[PDB]
Design a protein around this ligand. Structure first.
Ligand code: LYL
Ligand code: CL
Ligand code: CL
Length: 162
């Protein structure tokens, strides 16, 4: 298992513009296009991102391409965050995947306000952190997924992803 397989499991793959769980225009492997509720803004965005007029549809290769960039962007976001960097580096590899997933799903922003959890993760207080983590809108809106990630933090193994 690795970060890509992991996130490809959590986000799925779709070749046509779609609305995510928050009702936003997305495509491929969880690639957010825009927050605006205008489809046309979305297609514009899609066009800009691929480098061609897609008319709302892309190839697998194209999705995978966006995906590579996106993973990359997430990690790099982590490492550039003073609050995040230190935690992330304190962790082992599996656990690090869990951190990327959260960041991929919610942004460096969303993750930065998980102060308390962050701290607990840094201290290696696994179960403690796992409980804290659950007390959140994130867990409550996307429970199956949050569950997987949390377990991942808690145990350091890939069991949640079987
Ligand atoms: C709940 C936060 C866990 C966490 C620790 C380190 C770095 C990132 C990006 C992260 O999401
Ligand atoms: Cl792009
Ligand atoms: Cl879910």
């Amino acid at each position: 298992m690795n970060i890509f397989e992991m996130l490809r499991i959590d986000e799925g793959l779709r070749l046509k513009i779609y609305k995510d769980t928050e009702g936003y225009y997305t495509i491929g492997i969880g690639h957010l296009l825009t927050k605006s509720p205008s489809l046309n803004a979305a297609k514009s965005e899609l066009d800009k991102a691929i480098g061609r007029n897609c008319n709302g549809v892309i190839t697998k290769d194209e999705a995978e391409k966006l995906f590579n960039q996106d993973v990359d962007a997430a990690v790099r976001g982590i490492l550039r965050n003073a609050k995040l960097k230190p935690v992330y580096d304190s962790l082992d590899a599996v656990r690090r995947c869990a951190a990327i997933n959260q960041v991929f799903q919610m942004g460096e922003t969303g993750v930065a306000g998980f102060t308390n959890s962050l701290r607990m993760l840094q201290q290696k207080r696994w179960d403690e952190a796992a409980v804290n983590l659950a007390k959140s809108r994130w867990y409550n809106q996307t429970p199956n997924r949050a569950k997987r990630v949390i377990t991942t933090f808690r145990t350091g193994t890939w069991d949640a992803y079987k």
